[PDB]
Amino acid sequence: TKVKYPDGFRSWYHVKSMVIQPGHPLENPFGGIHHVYANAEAIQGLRGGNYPDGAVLVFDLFDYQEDNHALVEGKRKLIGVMERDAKRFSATGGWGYEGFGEGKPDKRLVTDGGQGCFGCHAAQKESQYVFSRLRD
Amino acid sequence: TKVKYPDGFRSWYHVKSMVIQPGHPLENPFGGIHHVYANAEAIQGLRGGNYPDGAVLVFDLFDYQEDNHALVEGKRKLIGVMERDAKRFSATGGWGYEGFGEGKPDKRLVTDGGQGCFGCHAAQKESQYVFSRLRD
Ligand code: HEC
Ligand code: HEC
Ligand SMILES: [Zn+2]
Ligand SMILES: [Zn+2]
């Protein structure tokens, strides 16, 4: 019933990126520069298919340093992970939600079976609980 | 003698990202959110191996918009492209330099054989004229 650590996600397709600066509603704990990655199965859902079991999306969050009006990536803060399994994760709309502190497999962040994550993602039910959209 | 448009570069490994904001010395013309991509041959050279002819690095530059203490990706401004051919691009350190406006294959930007690009990259001779470093 645990989300698997998504080994090798850095080699996956880069969906998009966004900077969340101090003052943003999501600052705690998602402040920083994040990159969204999708495995092959998740790309099927992002393209307008149904997300297959085994789809994984990763929210890869870095600290940044503002230096002379450049925002420069610092250390990895955490990753967020969504793992599709319609049966195993039925209580949170078919996605398992986990966080890994500093992107380390032994630093699991979710302590409520992913209900809090799901509570916010639920608004995106019509896009299968996923915020990020494919871009060129 | 022309640098090839790097078709399918959006499927390549994402090396790193950076934001260049107003008041930074590179704001014209590199202001925005940029993502660096590397093909297989470029990964060999980055990882600390040497760069094979055929290595390609892409600088993918987006305008961004301010949205309530987030910086959100906007339209693509341009791509920069370095293609390795030690013999063909010998006049610019063995990399061919090209810009494509809005990332469109039909909007080539470089008019001086890439000597302007190379002038800045020459400072990075000890890393084979590449600024970007691999990160986790
Ligand atoms: C200094 C005034 C520069 C000039 C002129 C050009 N580039 Fe460059 N480039 C510069 C920097 C500081 C960086 C690193 C950005 C980062 O995120 O660390 C880059 C990077 C590239 C890359 C990616 C590979 C690398 O060397 O890191 C490419 C593909 C690239 N630049 C291409 C490019 C082209 C085609 C230029 C002339 C049109 C050009 N650059 C000029 C700094 C400078
Ligand atoms: C209060 C709102 C909110 C909460 C709580 C939340 N997120 Fe999300 N999450 C977002 C938003 C907004 C995005 C889209 C970011 C973007 O567009 O770059 C996002 C994106 C993601 C993504 C990339 C896929 C997508 O849907 O775009 C993953 C993976 C993710 N979140 C995981 C988590 C996990 C794991 C938790 C709990 C540990 C969680 N999130 C909590 C708002 C939330
Ligand atoms: Zn405010
Ligand atoms: Zn600033």
Author numbering:
A (entry chain B), B (entry chain A): 3 to 138
Sentences copied from the publication:
In M. capsulatus (Bath), two related β-sheet proteins (31% sequence identity) have been previously identified, a cytochrome P460 (McP460) and a cytochrome c′ (McCP-β)5,6 encoded by the CytL and CytS genes respectively. Cytochromes P460, defined by an unusual porphyrin-Lys cross link at the 13′ meso carbon, catalyse the oxidation of hydroxylamine (NH2OH) to form N2O under anaerobic conditions. In contrast, cyts cp-β (the only known cytochromes c′ with a β-sheet fold) lack this crosslink and appears to be optimized for binding non-polar molecules (including NO and CO) without enzymatic conversion. High resolution crystal structures reveal a highly similar tertiary structure between the two proteins but major structural differences around the heme pocket consistent with a switch of function between hydroxylamine oxidation (P460) and NO binding/sequestration (cyt cp-β).
The crystal structure of McCP-β was solved by SAD using the anomalous signal of the intrinsic heme Fe, and the structure determined to 1.61 Å resolution. McCP-β displays a highly β-sheet fold that is quite unlike any known cytochrome c′ structures (all previous examples being 4 α-helix bundles), yet very similar to McP460. McCP-β exhibits a novel distal pocket structure relative to NeP460, McP460 and all cyt cp-α structures. The pocket is comprised of hydrophobic residues, with two aromatic Phe residues (Phe 32 and Phe 61) centrally located above the Fe in a ‘capping’ position well-suited to sterically influencing the binding of diatomic ligands (we name this structural feature the ‘Phe Cap’). In contrast to the structures of cyt P460, no heme-protein crosslink is observed in the McCP-β structure and the equivalent residue, Phe 61, now forms part of the Phe cap. In contrast to McP460, there is no porphyrin-Lys cross-link or potential H-bonding residue to interact with heme-bound water or diatomic ligands in McCP-β, and indeed the heme is 5-coordinate in the resting state with a vacant distal heme binding site. The proximal pocket contains the conserved haem ligand His 123 and an aromatic Phe 133 residue (oriented perpendicular to the imidazole plane), analogous to all reported cyt P460 structures this arrangement differs from that of cyts cp-α in which a conserved positive, polar residue (Arg or Lys) lies adjacent to the His ligand. The McCP-β structure also shows that the His ligand forms a H-bond to the carbonyl of Tyr 99, analogous to the situation in McP460. The heme pocket of McCP-β is much less solvent-exposed than in McP460 with a highly hydrophobic distal pocket with no water molecules observed within the McCP-β heme pocket. In the low frequency region, the ν(Fe–His) vibration of Fe(ii) McCP-β is evident at 219 cm–1, which is ∼10–15 cm–1 lower than for Fe(ii) cyt cp-α proteins, suggesting that McCP-β has a weaker proximal bond.
